[PDB]
Amino acid sequence: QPAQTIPWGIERVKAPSVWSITDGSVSVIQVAVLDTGVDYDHPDLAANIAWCVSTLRGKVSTKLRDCADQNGHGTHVIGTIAALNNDIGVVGVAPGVQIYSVRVLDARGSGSYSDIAIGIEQAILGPDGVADKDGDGIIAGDPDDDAAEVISMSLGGPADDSYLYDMIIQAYNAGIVIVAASGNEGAPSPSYPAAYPEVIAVGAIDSNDNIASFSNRQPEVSAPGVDILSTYPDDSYETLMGTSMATPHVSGVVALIQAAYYQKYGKILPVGTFDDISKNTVRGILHITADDLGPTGWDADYGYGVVRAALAVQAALG
Numbered sequence: 001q002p003a004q005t006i007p008w009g010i011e012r013v014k015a016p017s018v019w020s021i022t023d024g025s026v027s028v029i030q031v032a033v034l035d036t037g038v039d040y041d042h043p044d045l046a047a048n049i050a051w052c053v054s055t056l057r058g059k060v061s062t063k064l065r066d067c068a069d070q071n072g073h074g075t076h077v078i079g080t081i082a083a084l085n086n087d088i089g090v091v092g093v094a095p096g097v098q099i100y101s102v103r104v105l106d107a108r109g110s111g112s113y114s115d116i117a118i119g120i121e122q123a124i125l126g127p128d129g130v131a132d133k134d135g136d137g138i139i140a141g142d143p144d145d146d147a148a149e150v151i152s153m154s155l156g157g158p159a160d161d162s163y164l165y166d167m168i169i170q171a172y173n174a175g176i177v178i179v180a181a182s183g184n185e186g187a188p189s190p191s192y193p194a195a196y197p198e199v200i201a202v203g204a205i206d207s208n209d210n211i212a213s214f215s216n217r218q219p220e221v222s223a224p225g226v227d228i229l230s231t232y233p234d235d236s237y238e239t240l241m242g243t244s245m246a247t248p249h250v251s252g253v254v255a256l257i258q259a260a261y262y263q264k265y266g267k268i269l270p271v272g273t274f275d276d277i278s279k280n281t282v283r284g285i286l287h288i289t290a291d292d293l294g295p296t297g298w299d300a301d302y303g304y305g306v307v308r309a310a311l312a313v314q315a316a317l318g
């Protein structure tokens, strides 16, 4: 394996300076990545994969060959969030965070809306199959349960499926932050599920801080999405571009916020809304600590701006 290097995007979102506070390894926190699966034994990922599950064809399976990444996309996305900080490869935004790989897309990167909807449900239910095991009414942020705290969806299209949406609503109401790619058609508004109000739409910038021409407009925030090196099967590394690469940077920032907030207060922050500019919710923190590029304020290219982990965590703990 190659010596570790830090992809430009990880520095752009100001992650490394947070690690002293937390690298995401606060045990209650998991990030669920709904994608093409994961190279579960990749040396730069394996210790962070807590669950490798597939919902393809309406069958929930943890058979390794069913959950493994047969495309590369999911492994790349996961590495942006959580590649280990060690002597090899790359390093994620939250390099200590536990990951649930929820395979909702096939070897070609395609998926049915029912399989994605089931994947959302599985992020809530978690490995043990039960939403609220101790019956205390808390799901996300409860160390007695195994629900994820972030759902990261580097997938999207023009179709709005109410069954899939109802699952997103369920997750949001359980306290789970949902993050998704704005899309790559240079369209005037985001793809679904990014376009749902319960979901953070993420646009992509390049290494010059310019928004990528393919980035679907009107995102909520933006993040590195061009020339993104990350993990790839088999035990390898690859460079990709897309709002699917921007998305995990934001999910990683969210994981850091929630890990740090819990580490200090023993609870997590509420998800929040698109309009929130307070420091009382995750979304509010993301919006007010983002590097505000473009026209001042929220704008159709950058959204509220480029996410910044160090500032977000400081805001959460202040």
Ligand SMILES: [Ca+2]
Binding pocket: 028, 029, 030, 140, 141, 142, 145, 146, 147, 148, 149
């Ligand atoms: Ca959890």
Ligand SMILES: [Ca+2]
Binding pocket: 004, 044, 083, 084, 085, 086, 087, 088, 089, 090, 091
């Ligand atoms: Ca590494």
Ligand SMILES: [Ca+2]
Binding pocket: 124, 125, 126, 127, 128, 129, 130, 131, 132, 133, 145, 146, 147
């Ligand atoms: Ca559970």
Ligand SMILES: [Ca+2]
Binding pocket: 132, 133, 134, 135, 136, 137, 138, 139, 142, 144, 145
């Ligand atoms: Ca509970």
Ligand SMILES: [Ca+2]
Binding pocket: 134, 136, 138, 142, 143, 144, 145
């Ligand atoms: Ca509890």
Ligand SMILES: [Ca+2]
Binding pocket: 039, 040, 041, 042, 233, 234, 235
């Ligand atoms: Ca492997």
Ligand SMILES: [Ca+2]
Binding pocket: 292, 293, 294, 295, 296, 297, 298, 299, 302, 303, 304, 305
């Ligand atoms: Ca702006």
